[PDB]
Design a binder for this molecule. Sequence first.
Ligand SMILES: *Sc1ccccc1O
Length: 67
Amino acid sequence: GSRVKALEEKVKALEEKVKALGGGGRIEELKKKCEELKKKIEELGGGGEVKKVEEEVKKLEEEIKKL
Ligand SMILES: *Sc1ccccc1O
């Protein structure tokens, strides 16, 4: 990857972690935002708005880091 091509591979692996987890609370909020985030990347193009969705992936990533 380089920019966008690498983005899709980042969240895709991000799911294998949650899907393997369990319990409510922090896992709940991270779930709804997890999938909705992906579909947002499909609508995106090459640049511009790609910066916004990028921040959406940065929030859920750092989140699971603690839980
Ligand atoms: S990131 C993630 C976790 C669990 C289910 C779906 C997802 O996209």
